[PDB]
Each structure stands twice: as C-alpha cells, then as structure tokens.
C-alpha cells in the first residue's frame, strides 16, 4: 500500500511512544484462544516503547524467548478530532504484529523494519479511552525476511536459530502513534529530480490522492514560492536551482494541497535536487566522481536493543561527522526513518538496505548438528513464497525511501550464497523488478568473500560492486603480508571481470579495547590499525575502488558462539561509544582527503 | 670497606642463587633468643632467591608482614678450594641481614641495595656441606635510608609506614654467592679517564691490594695489549684511543695482576674512556652537548618483587632501545649492577641514585591521624645519625659504581622537603663529601614541585637541575591550557635563578590501559598522550632544558591508598609490559631526533 511520513499541519499526533505499556509473555500460546486482548493482560509488568523487549529486564529467559509476547496500553483520543480520520501507525514491529482496539482487529504485519497503519475511526470515540493490544511475534522461518528456523523441542518450548550475526532483537522498536487526517487527504507522493551539467533543472511530481485537487508548490529554503504546478496527477517544474550536495545538503519544500469543497489537506515533502547513477567505473551524484567513506552500522546499543533513540542518534552522528564519514549503509535491515531525514538534512550519503540477510548456509562455523536443508533454493528452503515475501520487502523499503535524497542506492541483500543452483534464477527477477519500482537509483547486492571473482554467479545483474572482505582475518589469519596480495589480486580480478565501480561495504577485524601488543597481532588494538592501514594502501592502488565503509562503527550484540566474544568486537568504537585507537587512524585518512575525492594513488 | 665485582679467573663461584631456600616468619621475635640458626628452621616452606618474599605466596598476611624473616639453605664447598680464600657475598639483602654459617656469625648489614661480603674460610671445610642462615629485617625508622616509622600496635604486632610511593618489598632481592680467592688478591680498584678535544687521552689507575705487585695492562676490544703500567699504587697511560659513546659504547679491558712468590691474582676491569662534567647550561660527555631521554624506572614486576631477573632485564632493554630511550635514572635506590654492566656495554646513560627518598613529610595526601614529627630535622626525626647513615649510603653506591662509565651523574636524594629549617644545613655537607668521594662526575638532588623556584633553599649546592613536575595532574588537574603556562613560567624562572642545565627526571600522568575518551580527560590513554605532547612542546621552547625522563617506564606497585589504583598507573607500559598508546608517541619523538640532540626549538 501507500506510505507517507506523518508531519503535523491539517493532521496532528498523540505519540503513544509514551513509553510504559503493560507487557507479558505467552509461553503457552493460549493467548489468542483465551482472547487476552478483551481485558487487561494479567501477570504483566511495565516495559518501555520504543526499545527491544529482550534486554530491558536483565533476564536470560526473556532475552532468549521465542514466540508471542503481548503489549497493552490505554489512551484518550483527543476531543478536537471530531468526525475526522483517525489513523494508528507503527514505525516498526519487530517481525510481526496483530492489533486489537478494544475488541476490533485493526491490523496485521509481517516485516519488522517498516511502517504499517490503519483507519480506526469506527471503533474509536474522540474524547474517550481505548484499549490497545498488540501481539508480537519474533519467530523466523524460510519465507521470512531474514530467514531462519524454529526448532521446537520435545519438552514444550520453541528455540530460534537463524543465519546472521547480529542478535535477534524483537519488540516495538520504533514510535507508535495515533494520528489525524481530514476526509480529503494526500495519501501518496513521488518526486524525481533531473540534473543537467550543473546549470539548471527539473523535478517531476506524481501524487495519488484522497479525493481532491492538488496545488503543488515548491519553496525556497526561505519560504519563497519558486515553483508552482497544477494537476493532481503530474508535473515537471524547470527552475534554475540550488543542489543537494554531500558537504552541505540543501533542501526544498514542496507543499501538497488536496482540495474538496468542504476540506483542505496540506503536506510539506522535503526534496533534494540530486541525480544519481553510474557511468562506467565511476559513481555519480550530480554528475560527479564520488568517493564513499564511513561504515556499515547496526541499530544496537546497551539496554534498548535495536530500539530507536534520539540521544544515541545525535551522539553517533557527532561521532561520524568528527571522524570523516560521508556515508554509511543501513546494515542488514531498514533503519528508523529519522536517520534518513537526518542524512538528507545533513547531506549524508546512504546505501539503503533490506532485511534480506542470511540466505547463505555455508556461513558457517559449525561443530554442531548439521541440518540445515540440503538445497538453498527448494520448496524446503528458499522457495517461491520466499522470493515473493522477499519481493514485498523490497517494495516497502522503496515505498518508504524513494523520496529521501540521502539514499543514493538500493541494496537487495547482503552475503547470499550464489554457488548453489537456483542462485541466478532467484536473483534475476528481483533485480529487474527493483528498477521497475525505482529507476532513479542504482541497485546492488552485497557480496560474501567466498563467492569470489571466479565463482559468484550473480554480479552482472547489478549496477555497483559491493564487497565484504576479510583477508588477514578469516583466512590468512594474521598475515598482512600475503593478505595484501590476495586482496589486490582479487580486486583487480573483479575490475576486469565486470568493469563496474567497486565499494567495500565491509572491511574489519575483531579488536578488544585495551588489548595492546608489541607483536601487533590479532585482537590487539595495534593490529586493527595495521590491518586497516593495509586495506587502505591497496585501495589506493586500484582505480575501480570508489567506496570504503568500515565493518562496524561500534561493537554490537550477536547470537552466542565461539567466534563472538560477548558480541561482534569489530567496532571502531566500543558499544558505549568509546573509541578504539583505530578511530584516530580513520580520523586522519577521512578528514585528510578532499571531500568525495580518492587520493593521487598515494596522498 | 672495599667492593669489587666478582668475575671468574683465579677466582670461581658457586652461585647459591640456586633458588629454593627454606623460609619462615618469626612473628614472636623469639628467633635470636631461641637460636633458630643452630638447626633447620622448623615450620618452613620453600622460597625462591632472588626475589621479594612479599608476593611469592599470594598471601596478604605475608605480604604486609613487618619484622624479621629467616632464610636457610645448605651447600657443599667445592673440593678444589684448597686452603684458599673463601668469601660469601650478597648483592643485596633488603633492608638488613645477619648471617650464620653453622653457628658462626659471619656478617651484618643495613642498607638493602648494595653488596656486603665476608671471609668464611675458618668455619668452613672444602668438600663438605655448611648451613647458611640469614635473618632479614624490613623495618624502617628515622636513621634508615629510606626513613620510616614502625607503629607497634597494642595487640602484639608491628605495622610499617613510610613516606615513598613504591611498595616496601623486602627479602634477598639479588644473587648470593660463595666465591674463591688466592691468598694474594686484588681487593680494590679505581680508574679515571681524561679526554681532550677528541684526539688522544689518558687514564689513571689506583689500586689497593692484598699483598702483591701489580702489573696493569689495558687491552683492545680485540685483546691486543695497547696499554701497560707498573706500580701497585698509581699510573696514567696516555694512548690515543676509541671512546665510550651513547649510540655505541666501546669498552677496554684493564687486567690487574697482584703478585707474590707463591701466587698470582688476575682481574679484568671493563673501562670506558669518557669524560663527564657540566659547562654553563650544557651537559657534556666527551665534551659534547647531550640531550637525555628515557625514564625513571623501578625494580618491580609481577610475582618477584624487586627481585632481579634476566628475562625481565633483556625484555625491558629491548623495549627501551626500540622506543628511543638513551638514558634512565635508578629511581629511588641502587639497582642490581647487571643493569649498569649492560648500560656500559650498550652505551646507555645512567643517572645513578641512592635510596634517600621520603625525607619529606608534606607528601602527603592525609585524611588520617597526623603524627608524624613536627620538625623534619630534629633528634626526633632526621637527626645526626640520619645524616651519618645517609653519608654511609652515599659511600657505598659510589664505592660500587665509580668504575661504571654508564653512570654520568650521582643523585643524592629524590624529593626531600627543603622548606623546613635544617634543610640546607643537612644537605651542604653531603654535597661537599660527595665530590670528595668522586670528583669525576656531577651531582644532583632531585626536586619536588612544591619546593619551587622561589622557595627551594638547596639547589646551588648541586651541579645539574633535576625536576619532577606534574602540572595538569596534582595541580591544575586536567587543564593543559593553564598547566603549560605555569610549567614554562617555572622553567624560565629556574633558568635565570640558577643558570644551570635542567633535566626533568619525572613527568607523567596516571593512565589506565584500555580507558578511552572522546573528551580526552584524566586517566584516559588520550590524555596521557596530550599531556606528554604539551610538556614536550614546552621543553622545545626552553634552552636550559637538556634532559627528559618520563615518569614511569611501567606501572609499579605501591602502598595501599586512595590515590593509587592498584599501584602507580603512570607507566608508559603496563606491569606485564604491554604498551599504552603513549609508547608510540614517545617512540616518534625519541627516534625522530638526532641522537643526543635537542630539536631546533621545533623539529
Ligand atoms: C550464523 O550467524 C553467525 C554466527 C557467528 C558467526 C557468523 N559469521 C559471519 S556472518 N561471518 C561473515 C563475516 O562477514 C563470519 C564467517 C566468515 C566466513 C568466511 C569464509 C571464507 C568461510 C568459508 C566461512 C565463514 N564463516 C563465518 O561464519 C555468523
Ligand atoms: C607516602 O607515600 C605516598 C603514598 C601515596 C602517594 C604519594 N604521593 C607521591 S610520592 N607524590 C609525589 C609525586 O612525585 C604525589 C603527591 C604530590 C603532591 C604534590 C603537591 C604539590 C602537594 C602539595 C602534595 C602532594 N602529595 C602527594 O602525595 C606518596
């Protein structure tokens, strides 16, 4: 369906993020049968929203729980909301939600990183209290967007396994809200900026609408009406403009009016005049040779999970700004939109990514019981549904982020195994369909190191080359000397194979803060520094390398294992954001360069 | 008396350092009355020598023990030792030892950092076993060289307090040995190298001798006899030579022969042709403008105490060599001679220091019960004995180290309070007497920051200016900005006051390895780096500054207190010798310079 980011004019919101809700586990899965949502959850306790449920209670049994949990809370609908449109919206519900307003089932959602909403006017009465009950599921299976497998034990209980690193946080991770609309209402919008050698340029509106006529007006930074359009379906305004750029990120505001003889609906959609596409081995934003810096990130932090948080947000960006990141990627799931609004506002370049992670079964590291399906693409394991579920996941992200100028690229998935058979048959359609959803931006699929330049059957189908590489770490462990060869050899081997522009979307080594070594070896701070030094030395000797993003901005939490010391320790910063000695090395390189500019194959 | 470093030709040793001795505490102090040394200590256990007794057992009760402890062990005297001179030697016994060979009291010593020996021939029989019993005392009082105070509690037990930082380790910290001499024997030697504008030069022998005639011969590096002298009392040989220098440290060997008609005694005394003295604001070794780098060190390490250790020794020097130290100081006590032999051999410059530390009562940091004597120099507190005990401590160090070329300076004490009254009356005699013991080297007394350039009543009496300064740390805590002013202001204020050459013998900040901060504040690694940066920026803007030695090479152990987090954390390295991020900053500065060379008031 249609997603529009709420803002506040002929519409206003009660955020329900007001944190404390009633909470409970349903270890018997008797909750739907016993119709829990008709009265107050019993045996509950306070929980905060937004945040993951897992770590709020310091309890392993809750942390590793799998199945359904219940959220409940009450809330007076504002008196002024008349006969108006009342709309309940969740920015995310991690993995799956079902919603009961008093007794009315109003909503259902699968996907954990994108919004869903419903018109609730008929079971609500403005000026009165209404119960809100949410049922939340955190289970993953094969047609799910990260896939996974729930093993039920003989003894009654579930237990989740899956194929990615990062830990399976679940819950209401983002803002909920009740919001208000006129019965005339904008409900969809799309916008495209074309650029021309940097002198002048044009933007297209298209806009689905609740019944009404659209006056479309584009405003200055200073609110001077410099673009006007008529029509409820389409326009193009060719004004000679001020562009969205990386150092600075200028933005226009396109108000959107939908009219009836009774009503009016007014919408400001921030807009960045920017063009994105690839030319040969170059990446082009406003027809310029960019160079990417920054990291893969996660939504992870002590206590809250992947739960959204303003302070955290403000601090991390301060940190990225300081250290010279111009860009980052939404590692392995759609992030809360606020990050993107900030990126636009601040001109930060974003490779936007779907939750399609862990399609891979070789990854890995198993001393344990094998199964585990034999064929990756099978009706058993990655199947028809799964391509369809996956398709739907790509719609939504694009539905949400097409209008965010900061997004210069889409990412279809991260590290799928492309050595098994259906791997090109699975990936070709979605690659086509992606561009049929948005042809304004290039599209990639992020590449695991064992589908290497001679074995990977999928890369031509995409526009840019996104590599995750560990050459001294998982292989050649500890050996910078031979690691540098393999890496360059393999970067050159990609350059000729595909003659595409190359970005390393993951390069990094586990490092324990405070571990220091005169022998400069694995897990030491010094080693991280030497290893990043080297990867760097090597992108300076390759023309096709136009992007660099460090494995992890900060240490995050993982599934429990032998290869993870209390989590992934590959952060430049610790989880509480204290900088490892490598923050200061990246500091120099990233602020020493010219903005958006590769070195002189040296410096 | 006379000290000569054993080496092995007409003399040979059984080191008795063979570690495991029998050990016990004497909590009743009934040990001498009950004549423990007549039979095997009872209720004993194995202990290793050399090492401190305190930490070998992981026991707090033994670690904090005060009083007498007993060492005992047996050892066959070598058959070949005939009617020869048999000589028992201890390189150190920390604080005080008394020694019983079977029942014969052979020895007594107060001082913990210098050798003492005795002729044991008459109570020993070559080819047989003999008991060795040592009584060791670790108590400090006012006439002791570090001074201190033992409070006996009402309940029966002692408890030591004292006035220095470093922890009161005690025990047999260095090699013991039985050694052999002919009845003709060299027993004393002294040597002085004069240098002349770098073309040619002369060395004086003087030598006390067991009865016999001395042939004195100086050899090449390659054992070619290039200097010869006759006389059992004095010579000078003027040969045109190859000098002892800091980068490289060349050495000659002067054999020493003492003759009888029955016997011959042969002694090689390594000799470095080098001149040391001050000229104006310059420090001169072989008439050159030196610049000092390196640290204050301690004899401290996990498990062993201040006990000597070859591996430790080899590793630390590797570390100093790597990081650019050309020099160091024997912080607050005479070190094991092996360090000095190594320094000569490797050309490393050494400010040699006595155990005279803690003369100061203002230092400090007391929330607790005051007393504590009112007048520092009094018959109560630092008194006539104390100047005499102190005098004796200076003899011995000079007795031991006069022949070590690596020692370019003597240090009389460290951080005494010179604001109370007797402070110039106490210090003037020893300053005079020092030069009457060795006029070949300059002499200093190390200066605490609160006897500052306007208040310190003692500095003219010495040759070089040795300052310990903490300007952002103990005062101006955390404030590099104002700390830099005070420091420079106070360095200039010294330069004019005395127009002597200045060395900072202590500059450093407590730093926890692994503590990282974006705010670059106290106890963080980054702070240490900024603070050392700054002290440095400031010696580059002062002409009189010709020496820099970092507070601590590595973290050491201290007395328990509120200001010490498991010890002094001011090491560039942790106690297990892992480098803090500041090892790499000092690295650059120390190897970036020209050898022995201050920068161009810049670089
Ligand atoms: C199931 O969730 C978990 C749990 C714990 C660890 C991981 N590891 C992950 S995601 N990575 C991917 C790094 O981008 C490490 C990894 C690399 C790897 C490389 C090669 C060349 C081979 C042959 C096998 C490999 N196996 C691996 O596991 C995943
Ligand atoms: C008794 O054994 C201990 C136990 C614990 C700590 C110490 N501290 C020592 S030796 N230092 C000397 C540093 O070279 C720190 C120290 C500095 C200081 C400076 C000023 C200006 C004043 C007024 C008072 C001060 N007091 C101090 O204690 C000694």
Swiss-Prot record, chains A, B:
Short sequence motif named N-K motif, residue ranges: 568-570
Example GO BP: carbohydrate metabolic process
Gene3D superfamilies noted in UniProt: Galactose-binding domain-like (2.60.120.260), Glycosidases (3.20.20.80), Immunoglobulins (2.60.40.10)
Gene Ontology terms for molecular function: beta-glucuronidase activity; carbohydrate binding; identical protein binding
Description of pH dependence: Optimum pH is 5.0-7.5.
Temperature dependence (free text): Resistant to thermal inactivation at 50 degrees Celsius.
Residues binding D-glucuronate: 165, 414, 468, 474, 506, 551, 570
Domain of life: Bacteria
Stated regulation of activity: Potently inhibited by a set of synthetic compounds like thio-urea derivatives and analogs, and uronic isofagomine (UIFG) derivatives. Inhibitors of gut microbial beta-glucuronidases block the reactivation of glucuronidated cancer drugs, and thereby alleviate drug-induced GI toxicity.
Domain statement: The N-K motif seems to be a discriminant that could be employed as a fingerprint to identify beta-glucuronidases from the large GH2 family of proteins.
NCBIfam families the UniProt entry points to: PRK10150.1
Family assignment from sequence similarity: Belongs to the glycosyl hydrolase 2 family.
Complexes and interactors: Homotetramer.
Protein name: Beta-glucuronidase
